Structure formats: C-alpha cells, structure tokens
Amino acid sequence: DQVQDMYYLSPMQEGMLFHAILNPGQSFYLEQITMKVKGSLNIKCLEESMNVIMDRYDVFRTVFIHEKVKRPVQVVLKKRQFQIEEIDLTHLTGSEQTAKINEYKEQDKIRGFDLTRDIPMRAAIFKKAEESFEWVTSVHHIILDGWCIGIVVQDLFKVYNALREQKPYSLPPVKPYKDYIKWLEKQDKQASLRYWREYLEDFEGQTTFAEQRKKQKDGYEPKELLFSLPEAETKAFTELAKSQHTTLSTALQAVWSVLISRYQQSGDLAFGTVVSGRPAEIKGVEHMVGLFINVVPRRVKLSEGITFNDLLKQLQEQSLQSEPHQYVPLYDIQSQADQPKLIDHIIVFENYPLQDENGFDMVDVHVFEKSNYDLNLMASPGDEMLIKLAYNENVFDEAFILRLKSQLLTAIQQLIQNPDQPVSTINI
C-alpha cells in the first residue's frame, strides 16, 4: 500500500480543487519562484535534501481524488521520490539561455499540475556556466500557501549545508496538516457563516476608485509601483502600532481606510485583507506547513469625528473576533451577501517575503503569482517599510497610481503626527 493516510479537504482546499479542475491552463494557484545562484551548488546533494523535506512535510506527498467519490479526499502517500529537472545551457549564448528559461517558465505556468497524480511542486535548475545557475521552483497553493515557503526553504538549506559538509543535523518537530483538518471538523460551519453575514449586515457595495477606472474591454496588464516609507516615518508608525496594541498590518489597513473613505465619499467601506488563518487553539500551529492564509473582507465604519487611534482599535478588535472564522472561503461569504463584488482590491502585509551562507550567493529571488484583483496594496517590514502598488494597467493609469503613492505617504505622515484628531482633517 502506498497510502499513509486519507482525509477530507478544508473548505478552501475544496474550492481550490473545484476551480483548478474547471480552469486548466490559466495559472490559478500557481507560485513560481526564480532563484539566481552565483557560486558553487551541489545539485545531487540539493536533491537529497529536497527528499528529506518530502518526508518531513506530508503536504508534499499529498494527492487529491475527486472522481468516483462522494466528497473529494486528499491522500498522503508514504513516500514520493522528488527529482530536480537539471538542464545544461552551457553550450548556448546568453540570449539563448534567457529565451530557453523564459520558454520554460511560460510553458510551466500553462502546464500547472495534475493534482490527482503529480507532486504539487517541481524544480528545474538551469546551468548557464560553471558557477551560475537559475533555479525555478513551482508550487500549487492547495498544499502550501505563499507564507509557508520560507519555512520549507530554511529547513531545505539546513539539511543541504549539513549533508554537503557531512555534518549531522536535527530539525524541530512539526505537526501534520491533518491536525488542522481535525480542528476544522470541530468548528460550527453555520456559526462561522453567520459571523460573516452579521459582520456584513446592511453593507451595500462599492466600486473602488470608480471615476478612475478605465472602461475598456476585459484583460489584465500587470504593472507595479514600488516605494518605501522613510526610516523615521517607519519608526514612528511602528511605535504607534505598538503603543496601541496592534500590528503594522492593521495600522496600514487603517490608513488605507481613510484614503478610500475620501474617494468613495462614504463612511462604510470594504477591502480584502490576507489573514494568517492559524488557530491559536492549535498548539504549535506556527510551525505547521500547508494552506492556511485566506482573503477575507474587512469592513470599516468611519463615523463623524473618528480618530486614527479609534480606527486602530476598531480594526484590532475585529481581527481578533474574526480569528475562529478565517477558514471560510470568500466565495461562500460573497454568496451570503448576494454580492459577487463585495470587495475589488486587497491589502497584503507579508512579514517575511521570500524576496528578502550555503556556499553560494543568492543574487536574486523573484516571485510570480497570477493577479486576481485590479489593485493590490502590498507591504513588508524593514528599516524603511516596503510598499508596492500592483495593479491592472488596463483599468488604472500609472499617473493615478503615482497620485495614490503620494496620498498614502502624506496620509501616513499626518495620521501618525495627529493620531488623536479626526481623520476627516487629514489633507490628501
């Protein structure tokens, strides 16, 4: 028997499987990480390590069954042999190499995975010269969300550097993903839907930045504007969040709420927020690897005279309230609102972005994921906080995105200088 265990899918996994099967070739749920290596890499040993990781993390050994079954199940296989696709490009010119690697990345996006058979993760390493490699890893988020990859990479290099130097290693114990499925089977699914319904009671709908949306035919032209919050502002922003017993993520969502209240001319608004999805009742949940994070609606109410510190408190409390119900798929929430466009942009605060020795230099790490919203506000910590506006240029002009950058920066500065004044006083 190849099967170690078999159990049901989380609601989000089930939604993901259904949409993946029905929309093949479209890059859904696919993350592609490109690592450019400069230095010595022991590929054979890297492969050995990957297979240690295969046995360490049950999600990599999981496949899915949906045919001739009453309800889909995920099956953990006792052992699965991983193999790196190693490609030697050394006999090609530099332009040939790049074309070769882009060709691979483009066909890889279309290929996706057959979730009923494949390991939902693969790796190709391209050798371009003696000490230069390009290492493309693809993964399906039904087994591992984007905020988990770092954990796995860290363990992979720990195994790798021990194996190559012939040293012993030990790794901390990790709970299996089934433990999260078991936690989910104790939750009251109807109470969680009721939570979202009541939270969203009487919320009416909103096209964000409607007067700025280009009304063109459908299509996605992905663009990005990257910028940073200067260190002194970043410091004061962080101090304010700490002093108010909240997070940088919540503080940024609060500032964004003020900006959107002005464009929408309204005090009742919504946007999507990526939440961790990790239940505190699950001892050791921070070390688990699998699909946890979710996009949920954030609804913000701005009354007359509300201050920034008021807003920080309103959002911090609702985050905590929401925590037992973060497993509900957005689709099911939107159906409880008879509003398929309840939200149309999101805010993503990523504490530990993969994109910032082992005997080599990591020259660059780039992440690709397909875009599901026409505007995405993305931020990560640092001495100067890193902010990205990722948008669909077929909808928003670059000039408008640039105005949004200067408004966000001036709104941060003004709300941290006067966090106890009505946010209606801020000049944007």
Residue numbers in the entry: 7 to 362, 370 to 441
Paper quotes:
Nonribosomal peptides (NRPs) represent a valuable source of clinical therapeutics. These natural products are biosynthesized by multifunctional enzymatic assembly lines, called nonribosomal peptide synthetases (NRPSs), that use dedicated modules to incorporate each building block selectively and sequentially into the peptide scaffold. The enzymatic assembly line that produces the microbial lipopeptide antibiotic surfactin, surfactin synthetase, consists of the following three proteins: trimodular SrfA-A, trimodular SrfA-B and monomodular SrfA-C. The modules are composed of several functional domains, including C, A and T domains. In the current study, we re-engineered the donor substrate specificity of the SrfA-C C domain (green) to enable direct acylation of the acceptor Leu (residue 7, yellow highlight) with a fatty acid rather than an amino acid.
To gain insight into how the engineered SrfA-CFA variant recognizes and processes a lipid substrate, we attempted to crystallize its C domain in complex with substrate analogs. Two unrelated, highly diffracting crystal forms of the SrfA-CFA C domain were obtained and used to solve apo structures to high resolution. Nevertheless, a reasonable 10-undecynoyl-ppant-TycA* model can be made that positions the distal end of the 10-undecynoyl moiety into the expanded pocket. Structure-based considerations would certainly have included mutation of Glu37 to a smaller residue, as the side chain of Glu37 blocks the fatty acid pocket in all crystal structures.
